[PDB]
Amino acid sequence: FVEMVDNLRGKSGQGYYVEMTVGSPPQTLNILVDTGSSNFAVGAAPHPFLHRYYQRQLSSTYRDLRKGVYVPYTQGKWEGELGTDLVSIPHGPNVTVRANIAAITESDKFFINGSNWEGILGLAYAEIARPDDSLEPFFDSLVKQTHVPNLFSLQLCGSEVLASVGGSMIIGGIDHSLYTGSLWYTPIRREWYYEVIIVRVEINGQDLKMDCKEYNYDKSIVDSGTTNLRLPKKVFEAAVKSIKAASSTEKFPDGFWLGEQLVCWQAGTTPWNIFPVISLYLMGEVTNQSFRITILPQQYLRPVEDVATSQDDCYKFAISQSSTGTVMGAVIMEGFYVVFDRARKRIGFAVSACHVHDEFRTAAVEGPFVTLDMEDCGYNIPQTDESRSHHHH
Ligand SMILES: CN1C(=O)[C@]2(N=C1N)c1cc(-c3cccnc3F)ccc1O[C@]1(C)CCCO[C@H]12
Ligand code: NI
C-alpha cells in the first residue's frame, strides 16, 4: 500500500485531511477524515474560509437528489443539497465510485480559517448519517461498488503558523511498515459510532478504581474528528487529580487544566518525566481478556508555538471533560496504528512507527490481561420515545 502512505495532511488541532476528487472531470478537494460522523459533505458555495469549492455545474456526472439536509451540532451547523457524483481518492485505491455528496450551501462555525480542508469524509456507520440512515455513507458505497475489502486503517502522526501534521489512511488493508509489535483487537460494540468498551483506567500504573461503567458513560468511541482525549466528568476529575499529583513540583494555573492556557519551559527542557503515563484497558476479543494502550505526556500535551516567546516550548493540556462519553481522539490515535476492521466488527491497535516519544518511555500496546468473572462495563443509553417510535425496514 506504498501509494497510500503519507496521504494525510493538516494543521495541529484542525483535523487530518485526505485529497479527494469529485465530479467529471475530477475536481480536487481536501477532505477531513472523520471516524465520528457518517456524511460525505463538501463546501459547494463561496465562503470566507474556502479558497475553492465543489462546482456541481462543472460536473457532467453530477445528479441532484432533490432533497435538502440540515445538520446542527454543539455550537455549529452545516446544511445543503443532497446529490450523487463520481468520487475518487488519488492517493488511495485505484477506483472511482458514485457516492452521495452533501453540497454544503450554508454553514455556521463549521469551516476553520486556515485548516486547508473544504469538506468532511464521515467514515462511521449509516445509523448516524443525516438526514437518516437511508443515506448510504461513502465507505459503504466504496465496498459495495468495488472489490475493496471492508477495512481501513489510520496512522496519525503528531512561529507564524500552526504546526503541520501528517499521516496515512490505508483503504482496504493493513500496511505492516506503519507499526511495530503486536496488533490487538477490541470489539466494535455497536455499529453507529466506532463504539468500544474500556474496562480499566490507570494513571502512572495506579488504577482509578471506578465502576467500569463510568469509563463508558454514556459511550466510548474512537474519533479522528476529535482533537482531545475526552473523558466523562467523574473520570476526567479523577484523572486530573492523579496527573496533578504526579506533576506537583510544578504549579500550573487552573486555566491550564481547563485547556484554556498554555504552559511553557525553555526550549528542550520540558520535564516529561514528571507527567504520568495513561493506560486505557480495552475489552479483548476473548470474553475475560483485555489489552492496554498506554500513552505519554507527549500525546496529551499538545505543542503550540508562541509568537511572544518563540524561544520557549509551550503546551496545551489536551484532555478535556465530556458529557457524552469517552472520546479517544487524535491525542490517543497519534500513539498508534489504528485498524477499523469493519468486516470483523473490531478495532485494532498497535504501536505506531511514527509516534512521539523519549528515550525512557514509549507508547505501548500490551496484553493479554485476564480477569476472573469480568463485569459488563457497557452502558445502556436510556431509550427515548422518539428513538423507539422509529421503524427500521
Ligand atoms: C467531534 N466531531 C465534530 O465536532 C465533527 N466531527 C466530529 N467527530 C466535526 C469536527 C471538526 C474538526 C474540527 C477541528 C479538528 N478536527 C475536526 F475533526 C470539524 C467539523 C465537524 O463537523 C461535524 C462532522 C458535523 C456533525 C457532528 O460532528 C462534527
Ligand atoms: Ni413501519
Swiss-Prot record:
Organs and tissues of expression: Expressed at high levels in the brain and pancreas. In the brain, expression is highest in the substantia nigra, locus coruleus and medulla oblongata.
EC number(s) stated in the UniProt entry for this protein: 3.4.23.46
Catalytic activity, as annotated: Broad endopeptidase specificity. Cleaves Glu-Val-Asn-Leu-|-Asp-Ala-Glu-Phe in the Swedish variant of Alzheimer's amyloid precursor protein
Stimuli inducing this protein: Up-regulated by the Ca(2+)-regulated transcription factor NFATC4.
Disulfide bonds: C157-C354, C212-C377, C264-C314
Free-text note regarding domains: DXXLL motif is required for a proper endocytosis and retrograde transport to the trans-Golgi network, as well as for regulation of lysosomal degradation.
Family the entry assigns: Belongs to the peptidase A1 family.
Glycosylation sites noted in the Swiss-Prot or TrEMBL record: N94, N113, N288
GO biological process, one term: cellular response to manganese ion
Quaternary structure, from the entry: Monomer. Interacts with RTN1; RTN2; RTN3 and RTN4; the interaction leads to inhibition of amyloid precursor protein processing. Interacts with SNX6. Interacts with PCSK9. Interacts with NAT8 and NAT8B. Interacts with BIN1. Interacts (via extracellular domain) with ADAM10 (via extracellular domain). Interacts with SORL1; this interaction may affect binding with APP and hence reduce APP cleavage. Interacts with NRDC AND NRG1.
Name the UniProt record assigns to this protein: Beta-secretase 1
Organism: Homo sapiens (Human)
Main enzyme class: hydrolase
PTM comment: N-Glycosylated. Addition of a bisecting N-acetylglucosamine by MGAT3 blocks lysosomal targeting, further degradation and is required for maintaining stability under stress conditions.
Protein keywords: Acetylation, Aspartyl protease, Cell membrane, Cell projection, Cytoplasmic vesicle, Disulfide bond, Endoplasmic reticulum, Endosome, Glycoprotein, Golgi apparatus, Hydrolase, Isopeptide bond, Lipoprotein, Lysosome, Membrane, Palmitate, Phosphoprotein, Protease, Signal, Transmembrane, Transmembrane helix, Ubl conjugation, Zymogen
Residue ranges annotated for the Peptidase A1 domain, each copy included: 16-350
Keyword Zinc-finger on entry: no
GO-annotated molecular function: amyloid-beta binding; aspartic-type endopeptidase activity; beta-aspartyl-peptidase activity; endopeptidase activity; enzyme binding; peptidase activity; protein serine/threonine kinase binding
Subcellular location: Cell membrane; Golgi apparatus, trans-Golgi network; Endoplasmic reticulum; Endosome
Record PTM N6-acetyllysine, positions in chain: K67, K209, K213, K219, K233, K234, K241
Main location: membrane
Function per UniProt: Responsible for the proteolytic processing of the amyloid precursor protein (APP). Cleaves at the N-terminus of the A-beta peptide sequence, between residues 671 and 672 of APP, leads to the generation and extracellular release of beta-cleaved soluble APP, and a corresponding cell-associated C-terminal fragment which is later released by gamma-secretase. Cleaves CHL1.
Activity regulation statement: Inhibited by RTN3 and RTN4.
Topology with respect to the bilayer: Single-pass type I membrane protein
Extracellular side: 1-387
Active-site residues, record numbering mapped to chain: D34, D223
Shown stretch of the complete protein: 60 to 453 of 501
